Every structure is written in C-alpha cells, then in structure tokens.
C-alpha cells in the first residue's frame, strides 16, 4: 500500500566493518569510524509492483531481457559462480525462474533479476539514488553498535525468525521454517530500529560503490568507495544464505558483482538526500 515509502535515517557516526571478520577474504575488516549525514532510505526493497510502475512509465527493458538470460538458483527450478547457479534463458524480473514462471502471485515480493544499471535507472526515475555501502551498512545496523545483525547478536531473538534466510542443508533441503522458501513480501518480518524491512536476508541489495577489499582505518565522512573498479558492492544476503556456506546476512558482510549481472536472489532499495516529490 505504501511500498515506496522512505524513512529518515538520522545523522550519526558508526563503526563500519568489524575487527572480528567472519569472511576475511571479503574485506570485512578493519573496523573504521564513519560519519553519515542524515538522509532517507526506502523502508522496503523495490517490489515487483513498484518496478512495474517504472517499466509502465518508461518502457525500460532490463539488461537480463536484452541479454536473454539470467542466473537462477537450481533449487527454485520446477560463467556460473557455483554449480547451483544456472544461466536460464528467458529468466528475468517478470519470469524469475524462467519463461514458464510468473510474478502475478507475488506482486509485493522484491523485484529480482535487476542489474546495477537497472537499479540506478529505477532509482533515478523515482527521484532517488542507490545508497552508498556506508549508508547501507549504517542503516542496516539500525542504531546498534558492533552487532552481527540489525537486531542484535542472536539469530532468533526470543525464538522468533527476524529475516528470511535458509534453514536446513544447503542446497538440497530448505525447510522453510521461517515461512518462506524463496523471497518473502518486502514488508515481511520485523523492522529494524530505523524502520527498514528485510535489510538482511530476502534479497541481496545493490549499492553505489565500486568493490575493493582494501580499507583504511581513517575516519571518513559520507564515503563513496573507491573511484574505480570492476564490480559493484552488494549487501545483506538473501533467502539462500546459511551459516554453513554463505554467512552474509550480517550488516558487515559484503559481496560484489559486475554491474551488468543479475540473479534470482538480487534486488535493491533506493535512498535520497531529501524526500522526492510527493
Ligand atoms: C502496468 O500497465 C498495465 C497495462 O496498462 C496495467 O495492466 C492493466 O490495468 C488495467 C487497469 O488499470 C486493466 O483494466 C487492464 O486490463 C490491464 N491490462 C493488461 C494488459 O494487463 C498494470 O496494472 C500496470 N501496473 C502497475 C503496477 O501500475
Ligand atoms: Ca527462508
Ligand atoms: Ca536484504
Ligand atoms: Cu549468503
């Protein structure tokens, strides 16, 4: 009903990264103090319905539609990064598992198979932009200091699921214990302390930064990441994550993809310096 709404993220200083990295290769360390000016973040990932409004307005054809394929996780079927990633002809945001799938029953789920360029196009059409990695991580942390997750350090506080990830033995069995085998609606699960939904889990989220693993401990202000690179940074993990193989549903976690990449577990949310017209 208000799936394009934004929340005000307060100005502050926070610790980005961690001096106890869990995936050292990803440049989770070192911890560094970062100052972030107040800004606005979408409460929800961009949903199928919201992305359809954009396509209806602009006629935009996504990169996956133009290339004719996109990566799909083998477990959702009726150069790949792992054996469970398949390039599927005709998989795209409207057909998230391939040409015989549909989004008609999942309008409120995050849009998938959107590349970094597709995400920038949507956000700019919406009067917004992608968040930087630092803005994203600050927002994810939800006003808590040096915690694993938006809500704290326990995966299931009070015996409750707080995010949509994998349960069971990946990749053969997803039990769906948390209520969702694939994505959940963009407004599922509790919000974090800033009012954001599914900031970890559900779908990965593009950020504006180029990827590097080499970070300084210097204190910075509104950092934008390195000036060049080959891959853009994505954050937050997805419905596929599990501690056993891909422990990336932590705010400090991070991964990357080339900007023309797309996949069945990768979406985005927008940010803005000020509210767009309303
Ligand atoms: C995107 O555009 C399509 C096409 O106009 C919308 O689907 C139509 O919606 C009208 C009512 O507004 C229906 O009476 C038509 O029968 C629909 N046509 C088709 C071919 O499906 C669609 O709702 C729009 N999506 C969003 C999110 O606004
Ligand atoms: Ca799940
Ligand atoms: Ca997420
Ligand atoms: Cu993961």
Task: Name the DSSP letter for residue 143.
Answer: T
Number of domains in the chain: 1
| Ligand (nearest to CA of 251) | 3
Resolution value (Å, 1 decimal): 1.0
In the block, residue with structure tokens 């290769």: 25
* Burial bucket for residue 21 (CB in 10 Å: 0-12, 13-18, 19+): middle
The reply to whether ligand 1 has any atom less than 6 angstroms from the CB of 104 is: no
Q: Quick one: tokens of 6?
A: 């934004």
- H helices of 30-132, in order, are 48-58, 63-67, 116-125
Tell me the C-alpha distance between 202 and 214, whole Å: 28
3-state SS, residue 89: strand
- Strand arrangement of the beta sheet that strand 12-16 belongs to: 12-16, 32-36, 220-221
Q: Confirm if 113 and 203 have CB atoms less than 8 A apart.
A: no
Other C-beta atoms within 10 Å of 67: how many?
A: 14
Nearest ligand to residue 242 Cα: 4
| DSSP secondary structure letter of residue 268 | -
- Residue 220 backbone dihedrals phi, psi, to 5 degrees: -135, 165
Residue 184 gets which letter from DSSP? Answer: -
Nearest protein CA to atom 8 of ligand 1, as residue = 56
Indicate which ligand has the atom closest to the C-alpha of 75.
2
Phi and psi at 10, nearest 5°, equal -70, 150
Contact 209, 232 (CB under 8 A): yes
Minimal-distance CA residue to ligand 1 atom 2: 56
Write out the two tokens for 227: 């000036």
Distance in angstroms (rounded) separating the CA atoms of residues 47 and 178? 20
Q: In whole angstroms, what is the distance from residue 30 CA to residue 28 CA?
A: 6
| CA nearest to 164, candidates 191, 136, 188 | 188
Whether the CB of 53 sits within 6 Å of ligand 1: yes
Concatenated DSSP letters of 215-262: ---S-EES----S--SSEEEES--TT-BTTTB---STT--EEE-TT--
Domain hosting residue 175, numbered range = 1-278
39 by Cβ neighbours in 10 Å (0-12 / 13-18 / 19+) ranks as buried
**Tokens standing for residue 198:** 């599914």
For residues 3 and 6, give the distance between their C-alpha atoms in angstroms, rounded to a whole number: 9
Please, what's the b/e burial string for 129-167 (b: 16 or more CB within 10 A of its CB; e: otherwise)? bbbbbbbbbbbbbbebeebbbbbeeeeeeeeebbbbbbe
Mutational pocket test of ligand 1: of 46, 53, 55, 56, the residue with most ligand atoms within 8 Å of the beta carbon: 56
Question: What technique determined this structure?
Answer: X-ray
| Tokens 């938006």 belong to residue | 150
**Structure-token pair, residue 83:** 């054996």
Contact assessment for residue 120 and residue 60, using Cβ atoms and an 8 Å cutoff: no
Q: Strand pairing partners for 233?
A: 256
The CB of 228 under 6 Å from ligand 1? The reply is no
Burial (Cβ within 10 Å: 0-12, 13-18, ≥19) of residue 168: middle
- Whether the bond between 30 and the residue before it is cis, its omega within 30 degrees of 0, is yes
- Does residue 129 have its Cβ closer than 6 Å to ligand 1? no
DSSP symbols for 19-37: SS-SSGGGT--S-EEEEE-
């Amino acid at each position: 009903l208000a799936h394009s709404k934004m929340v005000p993220i307060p100005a502050g200083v926070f610790t980005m990264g961690t001096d106890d990295p869990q995936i050292k290769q990803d440049g989770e360390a070192p911890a560094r103090r970062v100052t972030i000016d107040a800004f606005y973040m979408d409460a929800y990932d961009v949903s199928n319905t919201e992305f359809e409004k954009f396509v209806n307005s602009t006629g935009y054809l996504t990169e996956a539609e133009k290339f004719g394929d996109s990566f799909v996780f083998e477990g959702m079927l009726s150069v790949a990064a792992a054996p469970w990633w398949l390039p599927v002809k005709g998989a795209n945001w409207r057909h998230p598992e391939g040409p015989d799938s549909t989004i008609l029953h999942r309008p409120d789920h995050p849009v998938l198979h959107v590349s970094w360029n597709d995400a920038v196009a949507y956000c700019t059409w919406a009067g917004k932009r992608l968040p930087t990695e630092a803005e994203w991580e600050y927002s994810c942390r939800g006003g808590l200091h040096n915690r694993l997750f938006p809500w704290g350090n326990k995966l299931q506080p009070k015996g409750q699921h707080y995010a949509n990830i994998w349960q069971g033995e990946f990749p053969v069995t997803n039990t769906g214990e948390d209520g969702f085998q694939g994505t959940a609606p963009v407004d599922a699960f509790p919000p974090n302390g800033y009012g954001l939904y599914n900031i970890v889990g559900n779908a990965w989220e593009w950020t504006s930064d180029w990827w590097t693993v080499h970070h300084s401990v210097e204190e910075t202000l509104n950092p934008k990441g390195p000036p060049s690179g080959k891959d853009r940074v994505k954050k937050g993990g997805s419905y596929m994550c599990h501690r056993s193989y891909c422990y990336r549903y932590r705010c400090a976690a991070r991964s990357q993809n080339t900007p023309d990449s797309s996949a069945s577990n990768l979406g985005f949310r927008c940010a803005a310096d000020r509210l767009p017209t309303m």
